[PDB]
Design a protein around this ligand. Sequence first.
Ligand SMILES: NC(=O)c1ccc[n+]([C@@H]2O[C@H](COP(=O)([O-])OP(=O)([O-])OC[C@H]3O[C@@H](n4cnc5c(N)[nH+]cnc54)[C@H](O)[C@@H]3O)[C@@H](O)[C@H]2O)c1
Ligand SMILES: NC(=O)c1ccc[n+]([C@@H]2O[C@H](COP(=O)([O-])OP(=O)([O-])OC[C@H]3O[C@@H](n4cnc5c(N)[nH+]cnc54)[C@H](O)[C@@H]3O)[C@@H](O)[C@H]2O)c1
Ligand SMILES: [Zn+2]
Ligand SMILES: [Zn+2]
Ligand SMILES: [Zn+2]
Ligand SMILES: [Zn+2]
Lengths: 374, 374
Amino acid sequence: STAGKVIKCKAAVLWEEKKPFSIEEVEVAPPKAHEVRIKMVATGICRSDDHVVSGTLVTPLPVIAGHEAAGIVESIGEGVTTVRPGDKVIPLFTPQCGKCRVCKHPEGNFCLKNDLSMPRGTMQDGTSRFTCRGKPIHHFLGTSTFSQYTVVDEISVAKIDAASPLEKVCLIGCGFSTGYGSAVKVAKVTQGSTCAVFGLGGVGLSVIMGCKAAGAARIIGVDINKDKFAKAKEVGATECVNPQDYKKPIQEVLTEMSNGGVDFSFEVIGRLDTMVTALSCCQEAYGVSVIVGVPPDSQNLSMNPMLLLSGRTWKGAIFGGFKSKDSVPKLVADFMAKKFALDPLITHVLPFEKINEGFDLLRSGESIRTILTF
Amino acid sequence: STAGKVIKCKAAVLWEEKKPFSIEEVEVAPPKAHEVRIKMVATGICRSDDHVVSGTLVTPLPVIAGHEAAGIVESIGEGVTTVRPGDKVIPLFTPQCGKCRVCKHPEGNFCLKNDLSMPRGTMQDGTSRFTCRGKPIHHFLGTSTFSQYTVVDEISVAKIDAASPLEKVCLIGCGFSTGYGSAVKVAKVTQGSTCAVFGLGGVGLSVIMGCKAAGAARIIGVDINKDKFAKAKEVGATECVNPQDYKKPIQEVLTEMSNGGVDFSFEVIGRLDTMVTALSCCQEAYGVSVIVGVPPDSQNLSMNPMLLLSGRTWKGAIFGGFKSKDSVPKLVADFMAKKFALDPLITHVLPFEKINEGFDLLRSGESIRTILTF
Ligand SMILES: NC(=O)c1ccc[n+]([C@@H]2O[C@H](COP(=O)([O-])OP(=O)([O-])OC[C@H]3O[C@@H](n4cnc5c(N)[nH+]cnc54)[C@H](O)[C@@H]3O)[C@@H](O)[C@H]2O)c1
Ligand SMILES: NC(=O)c1ccc[n+]([C@@H]2O[C@H](COP(=O)([O-])OP(=O)([O-])OC[C@H]3O[C@@H](n4cnc5c(N)[nH+]cnc54)[C@H](O)[C@@H]3O)[C@@H](O)[C@H]2O)c1
Ligand SMILES: [Zn+2]
Ligand SMILES: [Zn+2]
Ligand SMILES: [Zn+2]
Ligand SMILES: [Zn+2]
């Protein structure tokens, strides 16, 4: 009943940095060629969405944020072949165009069509599908999931199992896949190894899940909020340390605890200092450190390259290294077969209209993931 | 006969930084338990030896430098099982104790018994075998090859083929193995890939040799000294670029030349700026950059961690990642079997007494490797 028509619906519009979202009516244009309009069902609150608010992650404003979500296709534009109306879908904040040199590379996943490296806040065609108060509103990472309806490019959506529980599998759209893949795919954690995970939010807990799935013998969680430790141990941490408890820098503490450095470390916070600490704490000759946290816009870290010359490997990744469109449906299928759990990440459920309370819960340190229901 | 006796011989002593080597008589003590005294036959001039002179690489002075060499065992201390008097040997500036967690790790080679991290300038037992004018003289990297005789710990020497030409295979003691391994073992260059090699000295040429051996389709040499380009092309570079010739930064040039970034880059100079440029020029999603150049003492680089978050891998290595004592004899056997060439690295052959002339050739940009012959 809405195909080819503008939809008026509620969205969470961010007009200004460091302000609450405004829940108000927007106009969502119908999909153009190779575009898909989605009725959203559930969306998670990822710290990266908060980074938009705080100006940590710069993207044009005003904007409809949200990138961790699931919904049901309302309509498809001309030439769409990979989804149909009524399909369950997860928007892909990292696209998979299938054509660029990264998509063709066996390891690569950061498709050249992404809107993360130099955000423009548009559809692929450089325009917006959103109007609010007669004003155009930017997209975010091609997804804009904080809206009852969004429009995405076909390369930014994956069809998932029709029997999927959308209020759970929305986490496959960012935090779970990112953390789990950072361990299993990017780091390639080995059986019997020692891991250190800096930051025990939804993404860091997913890193722990992946380290445990990979057979790590020791998984040391690191957080300045000791309230995070109990859940980290539930999902596989063997021990947790709070840097604030120690006189010495935590890289020295972790090096001593691991009898000369860890096999794999993960920065899952977004601070320059913890990126360098996490590198330093991995064993100097054969250690691997993976950056997962989003750094503050345009800021450089300082480090001694002798940390690398001795043999360390330093890498980072978006979305756990997963080729998004190939991987998301498989991750959903694995979830349905109980190959991993998502409930440990979900601490709070709210209606979409309580989005600002959901961000309050994240900022206070209380929540891991709040799932918003439309 | 010399066994069990002090040897008086000629060595090149560096009494203080930024001075010529002093060629004079030293006393070399006999080897203690698990030590080996070696009559030197040939030693190369590596830029790392010059770093000791320039204060780029800090190690205790006064010192007998030299780490790239080959010679013949004169005598063995009690308990030595791996070499005998008369054997051809290469000193190992990276030891292989076989017992530490690094030596037992499949991918580690920076043995914890090394004297590079935190240089003491002694034997393993914390003492020196060298005196000169009644003063103790430090060792360098457990090797000290700028001497007619040296004493090394057993874990710092490898036996090699008795028919080895020592005036060539001394390069397996540092520059060839470092560069070649950095390509084939550390980076794991792939067939059909595009490589960029920053610095076309003896080590960078050995990186090119490894990239060509691994089947790279394109190998871009980068040097500010265009006199280095002809030999780079002879050993496999498909093209060479001088950053001084361009208005743009060379990372932008190399990204354009490679249609979006190279597969593998190598820093083979020792400058913070070229370490960051080399990382930046590899493809942002799947590129790999290897640091080979020794950085200036205690200086930190500045970089944006978004370079890693998109998917790049950044690593470094000592001695090409080779486990030294296992690898050196095999590299010499491979050379004897014509699997690689060393003559392209050798531009000058001088008597040992002309060490300062050999360093002046390196500093002027006029040599690759000078081999000093005893
Ligand atoms: N690379 C990707 O594709 C990707 C995906 C998803 C999230 N992210 C980023 O990953 C980071 C974590 O996201 P999240 O799990 O949703 O966030 P979160 O829930 O805010 O978790 C971060 C955790 O870090 C802890 N912390 C803060 N400061 C320190 C410190 N100094 N030392 C140790 N712990 C500290 C903090 O207490 C919290 O539990 C954020 O920067 C996100 O933007 C990146
Ligand atoms: N990691 C290891 O185990 C290891 C082993 C051997 C050597 N090294 C280091 O590797 C580096 C190279 O050694 P080498 O080949 O003997 O030295 P080298 O022969 O002096 O070669 C260095 C090359 O870099 C070139 N160069 C200088 N500045 C620039 C610049 N700004 N941009 C481009 N090219 C430039 C220079 O012209 C020369 O051809 C040195 O820092 C050594 O200390 C490290
Ligand atoms: Zn693509
Ligand atoms: Zn996210
Ligand atoms: Zn060892
Ligand atoms: Zn060297």
